Write a protein that binds this ligand. Structure first.
Ligand SMILES: Nc1ncnc2c1ncn2[C@@H]1O[C@H](CO)[C@@H](O)[C@H]1O
Ligand code: MET
Length: 488
């Protein structure tokens, strides 16, 4: 039973959540749900990044105060993430008392430890700098400790060779942010308090739970808890250099690892407003469900930093072929005979213990795939099993055994076997498709657990069910694109 704290980058409170942002939150959510399925203590945390010029600029545009805007933005963001079933344990804000206190604490410790330097610059003004260069050797060692992604470890080497420089962490009024203690008119640069927002969001969660020990257990220097940050390749510098150094210099633990992902493209190109491929998360949900996108992204994700392409044409074909025709089909083609011919009761023995064992034996490799973030590999393995299950059903041909008087026992054995194979597949896909999983659990009259597959459902009553998942079509994609054009 590990203790894990997982975060997603904090979205700026200056715009709506789009499909690009969703790649990150969905990737993290699938991993998080799998970790919870394996029994670990997981804390999935996020928050809105509500300070700085990005927010100040937007607030000005629509003539509204930052506090009012960030409030509305926070609500809109959370509604969208909830719509995609991103299971955060806490979604907070960088503009909070928790973040202010922790930002002041870390700043005070850095200054006291001699890592803060002061210098004037050009109109003139005194600024405060973080002495990142004094952490080079430690960062080098940490970088080479076999944790980071190869592509990331290599990118950092380029940065180390270019030489680390002191970082300007102060900004002058007027600025929407936290005031620097003992420095009138000076504010902390947004990127200084933003990552501290991870800590602020966790402190908020601990305080809400009335938990007075967890914060220190997770952030103290010799913590045995694991800390992971899911981020895009454009903010790796802040998370791999500035951030770990800020923590080191203030007596806090550094990240256990950074999980970096690439960018989402649509139809092979960067999202385009004029073409209707710049799609907002809220707009997507008006046309499709969350599971469809979660599945598509997951099928293409890996442990590398490669870009992920949402080919709209391929989207419809893949969702129907895999979810509808392979997985769900396994249940619908066997459930009829069971509910009508056997009052929903499954057979008392496995018709083919061998085949079932093949399915449960795959748990090791599939679980390792979810764990290592090789999502594409996990999906390929799962669909390979689905093909196997559907082939079994074809060979046994229940529709033939159905019209053969006196073969009821054989029929129930065949169809129950298929439903049990479906049970295993839905368990492996549970981290990916939260809603379909709930519908499957209602049908099976069972909660799906990772170890539960070792015990197939025998002499078990299943419920009748309406379509678990309907096919989607290109007309819906056309509507989505047209709607997206109209919003621009
Ligand atoms: N088009 C995109 N594809 C994937 N991630 C994105 C995209 N645009 C922004 N992000 C991610 O959103 C996070 C900020 O909310 C960053 O980690 C960033 O990399
Ligand atoms: C603490 S992660 C902050 C990420 C930043 N808001 C970005 O949108 O890039």
């Amino acid at each position: 039973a590990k203790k894990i704290l997982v975060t997603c980058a904090l979205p700026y409170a200056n715009g709506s959540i789009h499909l690009g942002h969703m790649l990150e939150h969905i990737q993290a959510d699938v991993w998080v749900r799998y970790q919870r399925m394996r029994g670990h203590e997981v804390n999935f945390i996020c928050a809105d990044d509500a300070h700085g010029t990005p927010i100040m600029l937007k607030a000005q545009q629509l003539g509204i105060t930052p506090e009012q805007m960030i409030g509305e933005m926070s609500q809109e963001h959370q509604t969208d993430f909830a719509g995609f079933n991103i299971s955060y344990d806490n979604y907070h804000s960088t503009h909070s008392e928790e973040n202010r206190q922790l930002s002041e604490l870390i700043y005070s410790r850095l200054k006291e430890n001699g890592f803060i330097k002061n210098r004037t610059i050009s109109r003139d003004s005194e600024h405060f700098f973080f002495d990142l260069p004094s952490f080079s050797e430690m960062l080098q060692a940490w970088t080479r400790s076999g944790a980071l992604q190869e592509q990331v470890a290599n990118k950092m080497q380029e940065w180390f060779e270019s030489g680390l420089q002191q970082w300007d962490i102060s900004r002058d009024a007027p600025y929407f942010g936290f005031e620097i203690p003992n420095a009138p008119g000076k504010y902390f640069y947004v990127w200084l308090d933003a990552p501290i927002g991870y800590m602020g969001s966790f402190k908020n969660l601990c305080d809400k739970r009335g938990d007075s020990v967890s914060f220190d257990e997770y952030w103290k220097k010799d913590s045995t808890a694991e800390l992971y940050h899911f981020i895009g390749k454009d903010i790796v510098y802040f998370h791999s250099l500035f951030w770990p150094a800020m923590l080191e210099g203030s007596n806090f633990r550094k990240p256990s690892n950074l999980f970096v992902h690439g960018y989402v493209t649509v139809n092979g190109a960067k999202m385009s407003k004029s073409r209707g491929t710049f799609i907002k998360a809220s707009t997507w949900l008006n046309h499709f469900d969350a599971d469809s996108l979660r599945y598509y992204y997951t099928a293409k994700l890996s442990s590398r930093i490669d870009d992920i392409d949402l080919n709209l044409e391929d989207f419809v074909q893949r969702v129907n072929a895999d979810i509808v025709n392979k997985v769900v089909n396994l249940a619908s083609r066997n459930a009829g005979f069971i509910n009508k011919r056997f009052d929903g009761v499954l057979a008392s023995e496995l018709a083919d213990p061998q085949l079932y064992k093949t399915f449960t034996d795959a748990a090791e490799v599939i679980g390792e795939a979810w764990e290592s973030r090789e999502f594409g590999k996990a999906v390929r393995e799962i669909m390979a099993l689905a093909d196997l299950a559907n082939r079994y059903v074809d060979e046994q041909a229940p529709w033939v055994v159905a019209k053969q008087e006196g073969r009821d026992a054989d029929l129930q054995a065949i169809c129950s076997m298929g439903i049990n194979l479906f049970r295993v597949l839905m368990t492996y896909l549970k981290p990916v498709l939260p809603k379909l999983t709930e519908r499957a659990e209602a049908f099976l009259n069972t909660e799906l657990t990772w170890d539960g597959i070792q015990q197939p459902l025998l002499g078990h009553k299943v419920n009748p069910f309406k379509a678990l998942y309907n096919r989607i079509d290109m007309r819906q994609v056309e509507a989505l694109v047209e709607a997206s054009k109209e919003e621009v």
